[PDB]
């Protein structure tokens, strides 16, 4: 994985969890970030795209942002159904293809 993500994050219900990712100039620095959600046992789906825009059908509780070589995913009002692995994705101009984060697991309580 060319993008650096923390392996896991935990929080209580209704709390705000922020999943960060940091890349470089050729990827996150000049291209827009996508977020991919994969629920336990389920196929992965598009969560967020173009840094801050929600995919069709996604909960409004998700928000996104990107500055410099970094980006972040923000889940608000953390619910049990958000318990999943989240992946940062963006284009890399140096590798001429898609690059991905390792993934951040979310665990609720």
């Amino acid at each position: 994985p060319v993008l650096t993500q923390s392996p896991s994050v935990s929080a209580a219900p209704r709390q705000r969890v922020t999943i960060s990712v940091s890349g470089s100039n050729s990827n996150i620095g000049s291209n827009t970030v996508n977020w991919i959600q994969q629920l336990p046992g389920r196929a992965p789906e598009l969560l967020m795209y173009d840094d801050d825009l929600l995919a069709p059908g996604v909960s409004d509780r998700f928000s996104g942002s990107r500055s410099g070589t970094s980006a972040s995913l923000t889940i608000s009002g953390l619910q049990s159904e958000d318990e999943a692995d989240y992946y940062a994705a963006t284009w890399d101009d140096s590798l001429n293809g898609w690059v991905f984060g390792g993934g951040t697991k979310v665990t609720v309580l």
């Binding site: 996508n34 991919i36 992965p44 898609w98």
Partner: peptide
């Protein structure tokens, strides 16, 4: 084409 390109990144991912 932002949304489409984003679906193509999922296709590449999975």
């Amino acid at each position: 084409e932002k949304l489409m390109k984003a679906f193509e990144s999922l296709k590449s991912f999975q």
